[PDB]
Amino acid sequence: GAMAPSYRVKRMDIAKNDEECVVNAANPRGLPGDGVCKAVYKKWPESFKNSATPVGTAKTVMCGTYPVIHAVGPNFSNYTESEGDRELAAAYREVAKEVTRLGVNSVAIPLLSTGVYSGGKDRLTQSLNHLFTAMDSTDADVVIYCRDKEWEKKISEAIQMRT
Ligand SMILES: [Cl-]
Ligand SMILES: [Cl-]
Ligand SMILES: [Cl-]
Structure with missing residues (x-):
């Protein structure tokens, strides 16, 4: 456990993280994919052995002793808003386990x-709130990674609103 478990946000490539493990935004078939999944494949390609889920x-698949947690969120292009919301909550609950x-x-x-799984909608608040519901009962330091300047601001504001 961390001494004083915290949430933080950084705007940078998750492949350059300073944490003890990484969560890949995976596809269900264990393919290299795009975006986060692409960077993750380049950095930890050994972790894609039997990663389909x-x-x-x-x-979780180990790259040496470094754990890669392949978490499969729903593609909202295929799921109803209702079923997608349930599967997005569930993926984060499995990350916490x-x-x-x-x-x-x-x-x-x-x-x-x-x-690319957003179905063309802004899901910052939806996805972050499901992250909090799952991770709030864990004692790991959580570092959220994003790429957009405006998203960084909103994620930081949401963390500090709870403090
Ligand atoms: Cl970077
Ligand atoms: Cl995505
Ligand atoms: Cl982002």
Whole structure:
């Protein structure tokens, strides 16, 4: 456990994280993919051995001793708003279980279902609130990674609103 478990946000490539494990925004088939998944494949390609897992689940694969948690958010192009919301909540709950099982003191995590799986909608608040519901009962330091300047501001404001 971290001494004083915290949430932080950084605007940078999650492949350059300073945490004890990483969450990949994975596809269900364990393919290299695009965006976060692309950077993650370049940095930890050994972690894609048997990484396929269903929507709403997380599967950990070790790259050496460094854990990669493949978390599969729903593609809102295919899911109804209702079913997609349930599967996005479930994926983050499975991340919290894996982070707990691994005994890490820190985790790097992206906002699931916010890029090419967004169905063309802004899902910052939806995805972040499901991240909090799952991770609030864990004692790992959580570092959220994003790329947009405006998203960084809103994520920081949401963290500080709870403090
Ligand atoms: Cl960067
Ligand atoms: Cl996405
Ligand atoms: Cl972003």
